[PDB]
C-alpha cells in the first residue's frame, strides 16, 4: 500500500531509507555543503538559535529526500529514530520542520534501544549504543525500557577523535615538501575518521593491562604503518599511539568509569527479577562497536570487573552472552525502525499525526502530564 520513510539522525552519520528493505538505501554524513563556506557545518547540534536550527534541518531534509528516497514523503508515514535523551528542544524543532514546512501525514519519535531490540526479536535485553557524542546504556525488560537504570559517559567517537588529535600532536613525524613536528596546529575530522577505521587496532585484555602498567612505571609496541595525506605531506604515524588512543575508552582508574563498567552500573540499578535476563541478553550497537576486535575486549573487561570484590557481592556468577544482530553494528537501530514501520500499519496509528499536532502543540515526550 505505502512503504514508510525511516530516518536515524546523528552528529557523525545519518542512516536513512525505506521501511521493509533489509538495510538502508544510503548513508550520507550529517554535515552539509554550503556555497561560499570554508568548512562544512554539522546539522545535528544542541544549545543554539531556534530559527537557525529550523533552517539547518530544512536544508538537510531537502538534500536527503531527493538523493535518498526519490519521492515526496507527503504520500506516506515517517519514522524519525531519535536516540533517547536527545534534547526536547531538538525534537520540537524536528516536529516543526516535518509538519510546518514539508507537511507530512505522520511522524514518530521512538527510541533507538527498543527498535534495536526488535531486530533481535527478544522482549528482554541489556543494550549499549556507542555513538559519536556519547556511549548510552539502557536495559529493556519485556518491551518496556527501564529508564532510571541507565548510564552515558562522554566516551564515544568524539573522545577518540580528541585523543588522536592530542597524541599525534605530541609525537608527530611529517615528511618534507625530514623531521618538522607540530607544523599544522589541527587536522580535519573526515581524515581523522578514515584513520580510526583503517589504522586503530583494538588490543586484548592482557595487552591493555600491560599498556596501563607501562603508562605508570612498552610491551608489544608493533605494528606501525604510515598514513598518506594530501599536499605532499605524508606523516609516519606510530603503532603504540593508536593502541594508546583505544585504551582510554576502557580506562577505569580515578573515575571508576568506562564502557565496560557502565553496563555493570546499569545492571546494579535494575531489580532482582529482571537481573538475569538482562545479563543473558547483552546487545552491543552503534558506531564505535564497528572497530576491529572490539567485542572481545569488552566481554573480557566485563568479566574482569565481575571478578572484582565490589561487584561479586551483587552480581556474582552470571552468563554474559552477546547475542549479535542480523545487520551491522552501526545499522541495528535503523533496521528496527524499518521493521516497526513496514509491517504494521496498525502501530502507525499510535504515533502522532498532522491533525493532532496543529490543535494540540507538540509530540508527547516522556515527561509530566
Amino acid at each position: 500500500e505505502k512503504t514508510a520513510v525511516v530516518i536515524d539522525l546523528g552528529e557523525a552519520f545519518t542512516k536513512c531509507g525505506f521501511a521493509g528493505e533489509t538495510g538502508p538505501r544510503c548513508i550520507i554524513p550529517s554535515v552539509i555543503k554550503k556555497a561560499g563556506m570554508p568548512k562544512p557545518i554539522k546539522v545535528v547540534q544542541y544549545n543554539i538559535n531556534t530559527e537557525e536550527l529550523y533552517s539547518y534541518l530544512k536544508e538537510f531534509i531537502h538534500i536527503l529526500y531527493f538523493r535518498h528516497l526519490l519521492v515526496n514523503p507527503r504520500d506516506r508515514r515517517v519514522v524519525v529514530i531519535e536516540s533517547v535523551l536527545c534534547p526536547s528542544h531538538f525534537r520540537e524543532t524536528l516536529t516543526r520542520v516535518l509538519f510546518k514546512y514539508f507537511e507530512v501525514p505522520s511522524v514518530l519519535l521512538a527510541p533507538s534501544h527498543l527498535m534495536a531490540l526488535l531486530t533481535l526479536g527478544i522482549n528482554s535485553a541489556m543494550v549499549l549504543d556507542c555513538g559519536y557524542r556519547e556511549s548510552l546504556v539502557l536495559p529493556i525488560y519485556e518491551g518496556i525500557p527501564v529508564l532510571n537504570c541507565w548510564g552515558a559517559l562522554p566516551l564515544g567517537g568524539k573522545a577518540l577523535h580528541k585523543e588522536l588529535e592530542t597524541q599525534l600532536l605530541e609525537q608527530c613525524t611529517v615528511d618534507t615538501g625530514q623531521s618538522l613536528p607540530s607544523v599544522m596546529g589541527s587536522i580535519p575530522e573526515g581524515v581523522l575518521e578514515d584513520i580510526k577505521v583503517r589504522t586503530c587496532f583494538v588490543s586484548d585484555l592482557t595487552r591493555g593491562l600491560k599498556i596501563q602498567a607501562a603508562k605508570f612505571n612498552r610491551p608489544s609496541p608493533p605494528p606501525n604503518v604510515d598514513y598518506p595525506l594530501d599536499g605532499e605531506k605524508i606523516l609516519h604515524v606510530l603503532g603504540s599511539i593508536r593502541d594508546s588512543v583505544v585504551e582510554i575508552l576502557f580506562e577505569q582508574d580515578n573515575e571508576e568509569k568506562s564502557v565496560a563498567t557502565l553496563i555493570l552500573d546499569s545492571l546494579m540499578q535494575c531489580p532482582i527479577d529482571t537481573r538475569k535476563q538482562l545479563a543473558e541478553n547483552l546487545v552491543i550497537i552503534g558506531g564505535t562497536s564497528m572497530l576491529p576486535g572490539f567485542l572481545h575486549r569488552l566481554l573480557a573487561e566485563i568479566r574482569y570487573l565481575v571478578e572484582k570484590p565490589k561487584y561479586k557481592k551483587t552480581l556474582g556468577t552470571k552468563t554474559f552472552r552477546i547475542h549479535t544482530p542480523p545487520a551491522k553494528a552501526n545499522c541495528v537501530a535503523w533496521l528496527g525502525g524499518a521493521i516497526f514501520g513496514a509491517l504494521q500499519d496498525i502501530l502507525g496509528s499510535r504515533s502522532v499525526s498532522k491533525e493532532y499536532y496543529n490543535q494540540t502543540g507538540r509530540i508527547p515526550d516522556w515527561c509530566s502530564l
Binding site: 544549545n47 535523551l85 534534547p87 529508564l147 532510571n148 552515558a152 612505571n217 580515578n254 573515575e255 571508576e256
Partner: protein, 370 residues
C-alpha cells in the same frame, strides 16, 4: 570519666559535629572522600591524596568524589573511618576521642550489622569511653521542645516518618523510602541531559546539587504547569557559561511526590506522612495531624510545604485541622536535639560504656537503643 560529650550528626549528604550545650554546630561539611583522578604509580599507600571537608570543596576539579554512605547505610567503611578521624583531628575539632563520650545518629530501620560495625569502629579504633546511637525523629522533637508529633524528614539518603505521642515512639507505624535528595539530584542530572547540558564526573555531579539547592520550585498543580509553557530561566556556573534550565527545575523535585517517573515503586513523601498517621491507633491520628514536624534538606524547596498540605487535604479525612510546623534551622534541627539530649543529666543512663561493650558485645547496644 564525664567530659563534655561530642555530638556527631551522621548523614549521607552532610555530616555535622561540635560539642554539647551549644546553639548551632560549628563544624559542618559534606560527607565524602576525595581522590586525585590521575593517581600515582602505586595503588596502596597514597600520600597527599586525601581531602575531606573544605579542602575538598575548594579543589573540586582535581578530585574524583565518592560518597561512602548510600540511603543512610555506609557501603565503604574505610572512607567513613577516615572522615570520623578527620572530624576528631586538629583540622576540625582539636580534641581526642579518648576524653569525650560520643552521641551518634542513624536513620530508623537500618541494617543491624552496620550499627554493630559502627560501634566496633568507635570503641576499638578510636578509644571512646562511652557511645550512644539515637533516632533522627526523637532528636528533632528535642530541638523544637515538643513531646508529641509526627516527624517527616527528607535528607540526602533516607526519607522516613516516625509518629511519636508524649514520649512514645511507635515502631510498627514507621514508614521508610529510598527516595531523597541524592536521588532528586540524580534525576535533575537525567533531565539536564534532556535540556542539553550533560554532566558525568563526580565533581561535576556537585554542580547538579548546587542547581537543585538554588533553582528549583514545587508547583501546586503539576498538570497545569505542564500545559503552560515555561519561561526558561538562567543560571551561571562556577566556570562562567550560562545554562537555560527550562522545565527541569520544576519537574526534578516532583519526584518526591511522584516516584512513578523513576521506574522504581515508592510511597512518596506525601503518602508516607499519611500512612504513618493511618497505621497508628484511631485516637492518636488527629493529634498526629496537628503536630507535623519537617526536617532535612529536601524539605527546603519553594512551595514544598504548600504542596505537602494539599496532598494531606486530598488523602486525610475532611474537616481536620492540619498543621505542618517547620523550624528556622531545619538542616541543624537534628544536631540541636542531640546537643540538648547530651546536656541533660539522663544521658549518662542511656549510653553504652566501653566496659559494658567488652563484656556483652553487640547485644547490649541493641538493648539500649530500644
Amino acid at each position: 570519666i564525664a567530659n563534655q560529650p561530642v555530638v556527631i550528626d551522621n548523614g549521607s549528604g552532610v555530616i555535622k559535629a561540635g560539642f554539647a550545650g551549644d546553639q548551632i554546630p560549628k563544624y559542618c561539611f559534606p560527607n565524602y572522600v576525595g581522590r586525585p583522578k590521575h593517581v600515582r604509580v602505586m595503588a596502596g599507600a597514597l600520600e597527599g591524596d586525601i581531602f575531606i571537608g573544605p579542602k575538598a570543596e575548594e579543589h573540586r576539579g582535581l578530585l574524583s568524589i565518592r560518597y561512602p554512605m548510600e540511603h543512610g547505610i555506609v557501603k565503604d567503611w574505610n572512607d567513613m573511618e577516615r572522615i570520623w578521624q578527620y572530624v576528631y583531628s586538629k583540622e576540625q575539632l582539636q580534641t581526642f576521642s579518648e576524653e569525650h563520650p560520643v552521641l551518634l545518629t542513624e536513620a530508623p530501620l537500618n541494617p543491624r550489622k552496620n550499627r554493630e560495625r559502627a560501634a566496633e569502629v568507635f570503641f576499638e579504633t578510636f578509644n571512646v569511653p562511652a557511645l550512644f546511637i539515637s533516632m533522627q525523629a526523637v532528636l528533632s522533637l528535642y530541638a523544637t521542645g515538643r513531646t508529641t508529633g509526627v516527624v517527616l524528614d527528607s535528607g540526602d539518603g533516607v526519607t522516613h516518618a516516625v509518629p511519636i505521642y508524649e514520649g512514645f515512639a511507635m515502631p510498627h507505624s514507621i514508614m521508610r523510602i529510598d527516595i531523597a535528595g541524592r536521588d532528586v539530584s540524580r534525576f535533575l542530572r537525567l533531565y539536564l541531559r534532556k535540556e542539553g547540558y550533560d554532566f558525568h564526573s563526580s565533581s561535576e555531579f556537585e554542580i547538579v546539587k548546587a542547581i537543585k539547592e538554588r533553582a528549583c520550585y514545587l508547583s501546586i498543580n503539576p498538570q497545569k504547569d505542564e500545559t503552560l509553557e515555561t519561561e526558561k530561566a538562567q543560571y551561571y556556573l562556577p566556570d562562567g557559561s550560562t545554562i537555560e534550565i527550562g522545565p527541569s527545575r520544576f519537574r526534578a523535585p516532583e519526584l518526591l511526590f511522584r516516584p512513578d517517573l523513576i521506574g522504581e515503586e515508592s510511597e512518596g513523601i506525601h503518602e508516607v506522612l499519611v500512612f504513618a498517621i493511618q497505621k497508628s491507633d484511631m485516637d492518636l491520628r488527629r493529634t498526629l495531624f496537628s503536630n507535623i514536624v519537617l526536617s532535612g534538606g529536601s524539605t527546603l524547596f519553594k512551595g514544598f510545604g504548600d504542596r505537602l498540605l494539599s496532598e494531606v487535604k486530598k488523602l486525610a479525612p475532611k474537616d481536620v485541622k492540619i498543621r505542618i510546623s517547620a523550624p528556622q534551622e531545619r538542616l541543624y534541627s537534628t544536631w540541636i536535639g542531640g546537643s540538648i539530649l547530651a546536656s541533660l543529666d539522663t544521658f549518662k543512663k542511656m549510653w553504652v560504656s566501653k566496659k559494658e561493650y567488652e563484656e556483652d558485645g553487640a547485644r547490649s547496644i541493641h538493648r539500649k537503643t530500644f
